DNA sequence: ATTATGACGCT
DNA sequence: AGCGTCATA
């Protein structure tokens, strides 16, 4: 009743640059507009591996972790950008000089959480207020919403034959349906964080050149989910009414921290498919089941309620450099091992010296992570050790005596079992 | 032989 | 601390 929250106090939005390191390649070479296009890392082993794919190519189902050999066959015309290398290794710098000048015009609106290279949340309530007091009283004119979907609409009752015609008439159902005279509706305050996010992403194409998708709701899980809804190049909003009958047929592996194993275990153990099944349960159930934590997140996730904030933090807290050495490039001596610690070492060095000049910080943990011939899993060690001067020699001996000590060899010369990863990052920043 | 990242939870 | 999970291009 009158006591029960809704989940319905903060606008948040979730803003996604459409196929991103595409993008970044396109604007840097006009013959990929437009096209059937991938980006690539790594040429010699199946024509590369795709990490990116636009959407005229994924219509010829194209997509990322495909071969490039592979992704020819589907579609022969498909063009290809290469990732760079340098010191031996795919280097992601153009990406991460790209993401910094869309995050940077993102924060003019509102603060932001980077949320990955090519995504951000952004909180704005604050904002919504602030417009909403600009308005003062005034309607909202589907004119301002010209990319906007609203989630569940049309409903009930010609031109709704193509999409473009389908948003409008749900857009206009919306719209007819909202109380403008009310600066409390949650409903009026999402629909303005939809006007608000129009012009967020007006700024970011007009100076940037990148298109990008959006959601809008209130809380950051539905927000993620909203983006998703219609991609490229479009936002949608998704209401707290809209909740049930999106949760009703919705995979419950679509929403953001179930795509694994707890969502795995979730649909195993209380034997169902949807997120709108999860209502039926106690909280004191799910607790059972997934824990304290995860039983509590999960019996108000599926009432369209989450309360995990919008952290500002718009610089990544980490700076890692990473190299996989697969099937038969493993590195099975101890010159091997060091040339490349240090290539490693160098391209960290470079980063982190221009991370401290850009950011004022200095990072002061240094983490060694290597696989070893034979282990499934990301990681088989992990060591750190302090990092005290930005210097790749430093760093790359340091490195080396952290894990010399996992060489099964009894010859000095020798490495075994061989290295199939070699991992250094930097971490623990302090203000400078 | 997807690879190169990056955030956060557990004990 | 070191390990595991989940997610990004
Ligand atoms: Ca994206
Ligand atoms: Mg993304
Ligand atoms: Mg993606």
Redesign the pocket.
């Given at each position: 009743g009158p006591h029960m929250a809704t989940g319905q106090d903060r606008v948040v939005a979730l803003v996604?640059m459409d196929?991103?390191?595409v993008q970044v390649e396109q604007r840097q070479n006009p013959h990929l507009r437009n096209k059937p296009c991938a980006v690539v890392?790594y040429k010699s082993?199946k024509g590369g591996?795709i990490?990116?794919v636009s959407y005229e190519a994924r219509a010829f189902g194209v997509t990322?972790?495909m071969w490039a050999d592979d992704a020819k066959k589907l579609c022969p015309d498909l063009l290809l950008a290469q990732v760079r290398e340098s010191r031996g290794?795919?280097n992601?710098t153009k990406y991460?000089e790209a993401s910094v000048e869309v995050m940077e015009i993102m924060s003019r609106f509102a603060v932001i959480e980077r949320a990955?290279?090519?995504?951000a949340y952004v909180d704005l309530t604050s904002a919504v207020q602030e417009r909403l007091q600009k308005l003062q009283g005034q309607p909202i004119s589907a004119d301002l919403l010209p990319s906007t979907y609203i989630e569940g609409l049309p409903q009930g009752p010609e031109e709704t034959v193509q999409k473009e015609g389908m948003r409008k008439q749900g857009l206009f159902q919306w719209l007819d349906s909202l109380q403008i005279d009310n600066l409390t509706s949650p409903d009026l305050q999402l629909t303005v964080g939809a006007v608000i996010v129009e012009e967020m992403r007006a700024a970011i194409e007009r100076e940037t050149g990148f298109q990008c998708s959006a959601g809008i709701s209130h809380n950051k899980v539905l927000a993620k989910l909203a983006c998703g809804l219609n991609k490229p190049n479009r936002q949608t909003l998704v209401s707290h009414g809209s909740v049930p009958q999106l949760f009703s047929q919705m995979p419950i592996r679509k929403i953001?921290?179930?795509?694994?194993?707890?969502?795995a275990s979730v649909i195993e153990i209380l034997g169902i498919e949807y997120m709108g099944e999860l209502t039926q349960f106690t909280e004191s159930q799910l607790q059972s089941h997934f824990?304290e934590?995860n039983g509590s997140w999960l019996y108000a996730m599926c009432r369209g309620i989450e309360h995990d904030p919008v952290?500002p933090r718009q610089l990544?807290?980490?700076?890692?450099?990473?190299?996989?050495f697969?099937?038969?490039?493993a590195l099975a001596t101890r010159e091997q091992v060091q040339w490349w610690l240090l290539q490693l070492a160098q391209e960290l060095e470079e980063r982190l010296t221009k991370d401290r000049n850009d950011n004022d910080r200095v990072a002061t943990q240094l983490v060694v992570s290597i696989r070893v011939q034979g282990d499934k899993?990301?990681?088989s060690?992990?060591?750190?050790c302090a990092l005290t001067r930005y210097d790749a020699h430093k760093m790359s001996h340091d490195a080396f005596t952290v894990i010399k000590n996992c060489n099964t060899s009894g010859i000095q010369t020798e490495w075994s079992p061989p290295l199939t990863m070699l991992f250094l990052c930097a971490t623990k920043f302090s203000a400078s």
């Amino acid at each position: 009743g009158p006591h029960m929250a809704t989940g319905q106090d903060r606008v948040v939005a979730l803003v996604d640059m459409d196929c991103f390191f595409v993008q970044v390649e396109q604007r840097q070479n006009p013959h990929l507009r437009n096209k059937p296009c991938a980006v690539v890392q790594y040429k010699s082993w199946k024509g590369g591996g795709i990490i990116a794919v636009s959407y005229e190519a994924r219509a010829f189902g194209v997509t990322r972790s495909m071969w490039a050999d592979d992704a020819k066959k589907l579609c022969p015309d498909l063009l290809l950008a290469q990732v760079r290398e340098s010191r031996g290794k795919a280097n992601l710098t153009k990406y991460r000089e790209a993401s910094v000048e869309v995050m940077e015009i993102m924060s003019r609106f509102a603060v932001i959480e980077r949320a990955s290279i090519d995504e951000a949340y952004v909180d704005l309530t604050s904002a919504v207020q602030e417009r909403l007091q600009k308005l003062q009283g005034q309607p909202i004119s589907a004119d301002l919403l010209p990319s906007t979907y609203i989630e569940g609409l049309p409903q009930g009752p010609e031109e709704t034959v193509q999409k473009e015609g389908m948003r409008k008439q749900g857009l206009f159902q919306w719209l007819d349906s909202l109380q403008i005279d009310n600066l409390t509706s949650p409903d009026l305050q999402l629909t303005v964080g939809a006007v608000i996010v129009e012009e967020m992403r007006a700024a970011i194409e007009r100076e940037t050149g990148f298109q990008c998708s959006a959601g809008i709701s209130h809380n950051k899980v539905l927000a993620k989910l909203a983006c998703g809804l219609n991609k490229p190049n479009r936002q949608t909003l998704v209401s707290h009414g809209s909740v049930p009958q999106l949760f009703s047929q919705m995979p419950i592996r679509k929403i953001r921290s179930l795509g694994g194993k707890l969502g795995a275990s979730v649909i195993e153990i209380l034997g169902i498919e949807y997120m709108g099944e999860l209502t039926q349960f106690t909280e004191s159930q799910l607790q059972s089941h997934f824990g304290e934590k995860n039983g509590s997140w999960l019996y108000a996730m599926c009432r369209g309620i989450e309360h995990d904030p919008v952290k500002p933090r718009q610089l990544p807290k980490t700076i890692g450099c990473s190299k996989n050495f697969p099937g038969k490039t493993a590195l099975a001596t101890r010159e091997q091992v060091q040339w490349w610690l240090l290539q490693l070492a160098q391209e960290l060095e470079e980063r982190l010296t221009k991370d401290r000049n850009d950011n004022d910080r200095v990072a002061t943990q240094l983490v060694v992570s290597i696989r070893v011939q034979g282990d499934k899993r990301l990681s088989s060690l992990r060591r750190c050790c302090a990092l005290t001067r930005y210097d790749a020699h430093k760093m790359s001996h340091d490195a080396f005596t952290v894990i010399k000590n996992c060489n099964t060899s009894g010859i000095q010369t020798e490495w075994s079992p061989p290295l199939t990863m070699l991992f250094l990052c930097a971490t623990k920043f302090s203000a400078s």
